[model samples]
Target: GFCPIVGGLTEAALIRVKRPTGVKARIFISREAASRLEHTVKVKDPAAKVSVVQFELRQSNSPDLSNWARFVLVLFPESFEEDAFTFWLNHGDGISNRHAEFCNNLLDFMDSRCDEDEPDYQTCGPRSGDKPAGLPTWTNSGLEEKMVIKSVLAKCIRSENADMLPVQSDDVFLYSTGMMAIGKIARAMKDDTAVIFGWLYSGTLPLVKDSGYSKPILYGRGTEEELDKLESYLAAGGKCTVLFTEITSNPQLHSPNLVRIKNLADEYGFTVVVDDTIGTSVNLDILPYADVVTTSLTKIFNGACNAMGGSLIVNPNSRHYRRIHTYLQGHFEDLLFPADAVVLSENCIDYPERVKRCSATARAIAHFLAAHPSIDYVNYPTLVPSREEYERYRRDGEGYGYLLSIVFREPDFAVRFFDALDIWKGPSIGTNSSIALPYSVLAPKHIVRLSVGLESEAWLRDRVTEALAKATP
Candidate 1:
């Protein structure tokens, strides 16, 4: 029999089963489960292997479980959770029944199988929801529009995937500041009718804890536990407009469990919004599950800090799109000139190359920091161990990512380390050169954050080695 592509049943099956969290539940073995059904169901020789075992789960079962499962899951990229949207689009209906209509119509138009006289709006036509149909067209007509639109689109593209290419100016939203972009996303998801909760320190804080609108700054190592507790609170009818997190987060450099948190969001009914300034799309394609993705283009995307900018990208079909677009229109933050787009577009083509180098360098540095004598702790997600996140990390396709933080023996040493760094001191990474900073300054205290740039690994090694020795005192 020919190979079968499965989507709905697989997701439904995943959703229905309570994930086993014990030692025996180590690596998710579909073989034994499938073998139970093998006599009735066809299993192909080449495709019988399990594809997406949670690494954090396997690690929790035993350190070596993830290593063993990695061999099987890594080879089956088709089964990864990020590929869910693609698979659904290909073999079944897309994200939902609503999105499926848009996707199917686009496919029909591409194949010339569409009804000849159908309205353009019914086909793979441009999005005409809140913005004027002629908005992007008119903007692109003048050189000014080209520059502005291209700049915004460039900020949004992070990975090597070609599917991220922008189709219209309206699909892109440009902001002059990071906080403004956050406000934009919050308002959109909240739809201005719901009370939106904001947190500075912890993205995992309970939104409706005390009062419905009590904004709290959650700090401490127990953010993960807080996130889970927050989920439980929401399940009991606590309505949250959105949850926002910093990519690689400040001070700790902890990579919050997006997939596990996504599972919680799905169960509790809330949107997860991530500010991927530290982790460009190259490090994690977080948009699949996240309703909104906001970022500081000035940091990694600009690479030079020459232009200060921010961006917000929403799933065009999400319930929050109109609200977001309407708010931006009302505030007049929607204006971006053509020159800005040109500069951003020119730099975007090199994003993949930069991320590849940056991620590799970051991982190497993290490993070194973990072994250093002066360093007390390493707080990068790739190196940390967690039970709830292992599976989601593996399925996300990025093991560690490109950011790390080092806790020095003394907080003063962190200051010395930052001052002694020959590598440039900067706020953002994803550039062609290595950058370092004292987390004590950027974050709370006693932490040194490193945005390992796209420098040659050998050069960075020497730089880090020298910095470590000098800062040891």
Candidate 2:
């Protein structure tokens, strides 16, 4: 029987911790990271009963991507893993669409109706969440399917721009999920120490910490002063394996000084990784400074929000290009899976135009909100404190981006505004339909985050105006 698992959790290591009634397993780079994972899960969902325990499963240095680990975080709750998986998905952790499909398939196969219809993709599969995942790894990925999808994604990522050369298909790597793409970069690094330049997608926080034997140094503010501090750290005999950042950060929507960071990386001799999921390649050209760039195809890259995929770029022009390319060439696995590739390929066909529309609407919305009396602050890239840096890399005529956050004078006003809004409220961004989230309800501060979509700018503006009127007391 096939094993029941999600993400990079393969069969061999999972059977030891997998239980349908109890929980699911995903490994960590080390014991401390497993502990961090346990704590994060508890913090995100305090009620979750998870055990972070050590394991010693060593294999060949170049083995199957999912077949080795040092520790396993067995989260005890059948549905919690799915919830946690989706939670991370929203955070741009981007594990995999294949895993999601498998979990749904597993759940379907477990039920009696699984065999009732032959044509439905909810076909019979032996492994179910109720049983232990057995051996022999059953995941399959097609060579031709992935090659075609990877090429398309490569063009979609770099887009057609005169300022930047198109990304070659050979340099782009695909992952089962976006976070795995991040993890791949983490694993390829020379050591455990990393610098996180800004506040990242929240789900990426745990991965950056636990993905490798990571000693992640957080410069959450993403400022010029923070860059000085990072330089000081390097001068003080500190070692950094790699630098990780979202070119434009999440929630706060700040874009770091990527130019300075690249200079530092060049001078100090370390790899620089930039997550352009937010400051998408459609709007910005960041590959010049980054040794590698990664993004979740599940986001605006796959605007429909139905499929999940991640892409990693080995910048051909970067100093570390050859070495980084060599590492991936030797160890990388094309796990995008066949069917998901089709879904993502189709979802992102209009990537350039989609990005243009979403960003245009977002820019308009940002200005409208900034002009309003009730709003305290608006954090769009062009209006954020680091607008200069963001504008430096922007494409010839692209807007800031599709994301922006709102902070009001009073916490009550923010809450009322969030509840008053007539927009679709949910997690994840880059949908064809505009959506907003009550950020304070999820985080510590009272703020609202919007992911402007392909909706008409006039309609979206009117909706927010009406909502703001109701919110003002």
Candidate 3:
């Protein structure tokens, strides 16, 4: 439907995406995985195609788009499956909103929707525009949608309840997905050293794993003790240009002591990049601590699970603001499809209310599981050991969050309980209601990640209690 990149990609070539080895490699799509998709994904249109292409990243304020190579994919009209392709592009970084529109516009023009005479022709004429010189960048559109999305995000990040520094629409940058936003921030640093503060989302680690002069320094947990260990790294002259961490980690829901981390950034002269996808800006005000903040709007913001989107906020007050903001302006590509933006903007228009309802529901459910005999523990923000740390940046009137995870007393109990559950089960999150997944697929531990839904607490309680009763050995 759409190409992910504005510029282009290369022929079947092995781009040096120095996909890390051992543990890190699993975060990326493998040849085996690609082959598997080949077999399972049956294309109704034989003429359809999916190919990864490479394009040089444009450097700051320069017409030359002949720097670091990245992946972009293209698809024909016959191959458009909106839902599946949204996910495909989310994973493969291929196809985008404009690409889909490009096809729709092409068909509309060819079918003689307008004969270039009527007033409707303004909206339905041949879509020809001057190509931007140097490296085939996407011509920009969806100005108002992008502005609306950014304003909403900035407002959330600033948190009306808190006396946080001011944030503006101009400071936010949009992308096709959360990872794209993150990849941009990480790559922009292009500095000598960086740190992966806590065990990040599996796919996240690969972004900065091999970007800088040295491998990312890894700290598995965000506990105070872990940040303490980071102190040792700096003492030994470890140079971290930027530090990336989730405000609250996936599955485990561990929130790093960003207060301490921010202090470290100030003392060490580096930037702090925080992922607030789970502990979203609606519930957490992270700008005071983060030099740059990124979120996956695909999740809670668009709880409808219909569109893929993401954004990054450049903290204007951060000392490194100029360096980062300037670089992003020159390099950023607004590939958010006009069609996708329409959906994303509409869904997110209700973001605060949805997040609030889901947060309250999740809190009620987390308490239920905490007292259940089958569950050993519930790793929710309010109940976790890091509650104080999470609270440090929490907005004034928000619940713990919409996401939580539970560990079964026995390994088999998790599988049994999951099988018995009568709720929707999938390896994804942030819908209007709840979703459950075997989180062990992403994390090493056997835990069930549950995102609370919009349904009544009593009804969800009945569903879960029934499942546990049936699952009991």
Candidate 4:
């Protein structure tokens, strides 16, 4: 039996059932009734946990309780009688069919058998050769050891040009995540105001606001008029100390005129910080145009998705380089766990190759979506209105990126398309497998965002085609 409300008896929609021993017992399903029950239970036992709990009738009692269980039963009365309600009380209490299937599929996808045979140090902890000798039992070796992985990563992030390569390893700082790096920078700048150019990542706003030092002035789309307004503000003695921007904006996938913005920063005497997490350093050379660059190594840098880390690169060419470096040195703590760093370092060995492959795959999917009738518009660097601006920063033959967004003609269709697709669905981008999410849930409009993966083009195209066909009227 099929149920529209419960989505075919999947564990995600599971309900719990409890039948009273007496036939005359009163049944209650409303929120008010649940609240009364919770209050009574808590009054009897002060330490009891209480909340509104969802329930359904057992298969044997469905017909008798159909009127009482109107909320869910009304939608699919026939399907309700096919199976009894079953669920786990807590996360670790017991397993359902859905949990077992999810674990088995994920383990198989990860090649669990091969992973068990691999060296433990390759997946976690320090290598035997790197461990120090004569260490006291009470000593923390992770604190005493200056991780060699940081230096190795510094070399990887350093520019290929001889001038940029001369910058010392000390200029590169590592953190647990990119947003943390941005928050540290916001705190260090000590500015009266901070200007964010264009629609940057959503995480940047809260981080800047929480810094408690500067008032953030956001200029969306970075249009010429917005730039003029910023210039006017500075000309009138505005106290802006730093300007932040994404190399290529999220959702829109549009790049601001960075060269023009750099010129404005120079004249205004404000430092520039650019987030190149989406337009990765491998394909885009943004260092020459900004004072600082930040990247999330959790994404393409460690495509395996097994570890999390971020990097902060200080451009030696900027006047603020020394000041930024000094402030971070005083405040920065090695927050990245040693074991996580070990995993990230191993996974990032093929960063450049992974970036290239993901870029190409994203481009193909972007073109495919653009040609589809269900898609009203597509947002990718190559297909965006500001392609020329994005191209100015991209090296020849480099791919745009795997992150893209598609707006459906109707909101309902967008949701249907998302439901029909067989791809992995969740937040966070840049992974070995494609991910999709409802952009409308966060923003206003029916846009479906996708982060392309390493799957074959045919494999992805077939699923997308089937989904669109089923979703479109």
Give lDDT: candidate 2, residue 169. 88
Better of 1 and 4 by TM-score: 4
Model 1 Cα lDDT, one tens digit per residue, 179-258: 34564565455441122222333222322221133553342343667766676667777766566665556546556667
TM-score per candidate, chains pooled: 0.58, 0.75, 0.75, 0.68
Which lDDT values do the candidates have, in the order given? 0.48, 0.70, 0.68, 0.63
Over the stretch 284-331, how does candidate 3's per-residue lDDT look in tens digits? 877888999998888888898777788989998899889999999988
Model 4 segments more than 4 A misplaced: 1-167
Candidate 3 TM-score, C-alpha based? 0.75
- Distance (Å) between predicted and true CA of 190, model 4? 1.3
Which stretches of candidate 3 lie above 4 Å from their native place?
A: 1-92, 96-140, 159-164
Model 4 Cα shift for residue 207 (angstroms): 1.6
Task: Report lDDT (Cα) of residue 398, candidate 4.
Answer: 78
How many pairs of residues collide in model 3?
A: 13
Per-residue lDDT of candidate 2, residues 1-473 (tens digit):
45654443334334433333346655433343345456656767787866543333222232222232122333445655444434553334322445433433333223211122323212233442333243214223444556666776677556333565667988989876777788778778843478888855666666665565545888888888999998998899877778888888888888888888889888887888989888898898787778888888888988887777788888777777788888888986455655677777766767888999999999999999998888888999878878788878898887789999998888898888888999989987878888888764454378889999998999999999899889886
Candidate 3: residue 150 lDDT (0-100): 89
Question: Considering lDDT, which of the candidate structures 1 and 2 is the better prediction for this target?
Answer: 2
- Identify the superior model by TM-score, candidate 2 or candidate 4: 2
Better of 1 and 3 by lDDT: 3
